[PDB]
Design an enzyme around this catalytic site. Structure first.
Site, mmCIF file in Angstrom:
data_model
loop_
_atom_site.group_PDB
_atom_site.id
_atom_site.type_symbol
_atom_site.label_atom_id
_atom_site.label_comp_id
_atom_site.label_asym_id
_atom_site.label_seq_id
_atom_site.Cartn_x
_atom_site.Cartn_y
_atom_site.Cartn_z
ATOM 1 N N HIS A 193 25.072 -15.470 -18.511
ATOM 2 C CA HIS A 193 25.380 -15.992 -19.872
ATOM 3 C C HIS A 193 25.710 -14.727 -20.679
ATOM 4 O O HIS A 193 24.770 -14.140 -21.174
ATOM 5 C CB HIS A 193 24.295 -16.848 -20.375
ATOM 6 N N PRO A 247 17.866 -12.603 -23.486
ATOM 7 C CA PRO A 247 18.954 -12.616 -22.496
ATOM 8 C C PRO A 247 18.465 -13.713 -21.599
ATOM 9 O O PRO A 247 17.776 -13.174 -20.688
ATOM 10 C CB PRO A 247 18.922 -11.226 -21.843
#
EC number: 1.1.1.27
Lengths: 294, 294, 294, 294
Positions: free
Chosen positions: A169, A115
């Site tokens: 994101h 991540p």
């Protein structure tokens, strides 16, 4: 002297992203030396051979298959990691950074591993480095996806669309609708954006994984660094008390150039503020407290 | 008019070679339109998305995910095929060519699939086309591998080494030692050549498969065609009664340019003649009689 | 830090060669910073403006209009000089070098000004520098002219012709006929060479002066330096006791790379030896004794 | 077949602009064939030689030194003309166009000669061609100058500044201040613009003439055409009843692509409308009535 360097890139993780990144640089005649390190050394040896045999054919870089390479290593792109992520990944990362640092690295970090906004913060916490020297892949491909679809809608060229995706994101990213122009002319489009955000899942479902997209995006920031562009790229920069946030890495317009991030821009946000972006910042600000440990 | 073309490339087989080939062209700003056809359409859709999202980032081509595309399709690169090869492959091929032809193709074939010198002959037999319009990947990567290793030995730049590998893309290929120069200065090296020939097996063993090597090699011949280079490239050309052989496709110096092969060169061979090359030509000349059928 | 450099080029003499050289680099996306110094400062200011306004349009360098610039100035290309040459020119040169040196230059010299093999020797004598760090334009354009005409004769691509012109950049240069290949196949052609040698006079007569030719040639050696190519280029290297000569700079195959010349190659010469080359070396070896002084 | 073409460019006027344009294309590896026609044939022969000798050194085009060349000539860039302008120039032009047309040209015109918006209209009147096929250099370099200076002010990269100069390529041009962004963030600057408009005079005074600026600008529109970009470029397009005007060629945002102009955009103008732009349109609309004749 001996045989020089000047612009060296060390990719930790020769796998789809790593490999396609290297091949990008190579075919773009972007770096001088390009060193590849993977904990599955048989795989880096193997790609290094593969890259070297058709090299003759491009416009000239040298490739090489540990960390004693992050010497006068200009940039380290960290494409490694698992597939309970966050604290597996922070764990993997806890070793990559500790070791590039050991050879007394001076350079820049470019972290591509999901991540990411989270692993980008961790990279900063684990190395020491001023936060302008630790960059994250961010919403860079997100705003490429965005600019491609809108570019197709107006049938113009994505490079004339000027529209950003900022935030995390991932699920919480929001588009900056109020300052999205085509040339200098402001503007379903809420559909386009839903396709920009479920795009990974969409390409992953039909070919198992994403990798060309990003590398290309990873090849541009590299361009910005290695060439001092002063490019406005939407990366994963550390917030300062800039959008309202105080200690998080999130996806935001930053100016790029040889010595890392120059300055984060505050585009002026609708009431698409301490709402989508605050929400987003918050989602992450807390995985960092929930996460970490081992 | 509508929205043009001019230089279109159709890759049949979006897989490692296909995919890495496309990404090459893309990052090299070589073709205009690039169409991808695979019998596993979910995979071509998936790469087409992947290519399109970071396109913005390169210097400008258009990508698209049947054969009604081989219309005013300039070049068709046939990267498809099995993994009892020859007559499985000739079988697969028997359908690819029949169908590109159906849309009345005028273009050029560039065949990358092992066993290539054989599948290149079959492509010619299955389409109709003059044999100057059906090209084979050949010993192109072989002589790249060669020129890279010697280039490393003398520590010069592979692009100053001038040395060929001719014969069959495989076990029987021989190097042309007598006319191998470094600049204009003629020359273990029998070792180097044994590493050039067991190189596939060597990279395959440590990363499962070869693909960047060749694509790069596949990107150059494309360059030669699309730009009228008149390049001397060692491809899989059809022999004429040139090295002594009369009806085979084998790896040999040919001159490349927009309208297919111009002319095959006869380098003057040692008594490395009707021996290594004859042997080689013979090995293949006979798989073509042994093979074929269904 | 501040705003970096890394690969800076300082062209002394912003005039046809200087100007067209810069525009080459610029349009080739070869250097980072490119500084231009001319004793007619109004002319360098003027070209610097001209270069900067369409910069946006190329792939990214910075341009700037004294010698306090030859600081961490990687390469200095000396394109200045008169139009009784030799000792006017050595006089002009006597000041350019003295002053680049004053800012304690560490770099490389690339001298483009006729009579070059002579001014290249003088540059070496005036700076201090090891002779591997002072390069001369040499027969580089001569062998380009050569390779273009032969390339046209065989109708192949000049980049497949391998044939050198060595000796003095001028009347006495001779071609190296015995080791001239096309691919790896050895070869009126004495005509071609007479057109290669009266080529300047020929282009000068119809457009007043030569300048694109060379710059392009000046852009390649720059490529070789800035990128560590290890290219075999026929430059103006200092002879060692290599072709038989002991203290002259003449046009000869040398290997190029970031740290100046690596090594001069001795191609094996016909009895086109201590005859054309000796003759040539001699013609110059003596202008150096005849010349010099003020 | 014979030896092909595909993307040919014919520059009428091998002089500073013509010459520097060619050298641009050449060093950018933009066109295939590049033909040069000048009424002072000794000068085109001379540059053609000059371009050909260092060609070997770039990435591959062919160059050639009448109008029987505007055959399957893709694009004709008309860089010719005097230095009582308008009707000298329309007179010169009256012959260039009549003759390219004689060989039954199908292509596109790109007119670089001041007073351009005027000569661009004349080119359209003299050839026949739909007005989407006759392009003018326009305010293309003007908005480059603009974007360079602002880019320097904010210290960002001109390619992130989005700001136009529209109206006449000359005194009356106005900047479009209300829709000028840096990234997506809107904004002395009235000074910057006064330096953008007196820039020619300024570079002309210190080096006699402008030429690199524009060629670079002339190399981009060529890019847009030859590659189907769909670029938003501020050229000299014919007004339709778009900014309010009905029969003039003026500098305005148009979308570019292989088949000439696609569509003129109407950016939304301040009351910087039927004032600066109307004024501008008017200044020209009348030179066309005042001018013409012989």
């Amino acid at each position: 002297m001996k045989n020089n360097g000047g612009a060296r890139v060390v990719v930790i993780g020769a796998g789809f992203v790593g490999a396609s990144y290297v091949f990008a640089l190579m075919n773009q005649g972007i770096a001088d030396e390009i060193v590849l390190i993977d904990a599955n050394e048989s795989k880096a040896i193997g790609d290094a051979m593969d890259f070297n045999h058709g090299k003759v054919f491009a416009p000239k870089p040298v490739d090489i298959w540990d960390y004693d390479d992050c010497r006068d290593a200009d940039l380290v792109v960290i494409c490694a990691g698992a597939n309970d992520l966050v604290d597996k990944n922070i764990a993997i990362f806890r070793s990559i950074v500790e070791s590039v640092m050991a050879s007394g690295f001076q350079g820049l970090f470019l972290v591509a591993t999901n991540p990411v906004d989270i692993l980008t913060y961790a990279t900063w916490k684990f190395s020491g480095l001023p936060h302008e020297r630790v960059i994250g892949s961010g919403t860079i491909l997100d705003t490429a996806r965005f600019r491609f679809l809108l570019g197709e809608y107006f049938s113009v060229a994505p490079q004339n669309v000027h529209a950003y995706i900022i935030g995390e994101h991932g699920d919480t990213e929001l588009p900056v609708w109020s300052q999205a122009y085509i040339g200098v002319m402001p503007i379903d489009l809420e559909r386009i954006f839903v396709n920009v955000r479920d795009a990974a899942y969409q390409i992953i479902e039909k070919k198992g994984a994403t990798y060309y997209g990003i590398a290309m995006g990873l090849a541009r920031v590299t361009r910005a660094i290695l060439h001092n562009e002063n490019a406005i790229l939407t990366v994963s920069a550390y917030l300062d008390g800039l959008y309202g946030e105080r200690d998080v890495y999130i996806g935001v317009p930053a100016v790029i150039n040889r010595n890392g991030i120059r300055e984060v821009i505050e585009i002026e946000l609708n009431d698409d503020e301490k709402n989508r972006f605050h929400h987003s910042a918050a989602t992450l600000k807390s995985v960092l407290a929930r996460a970490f440990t081992r």
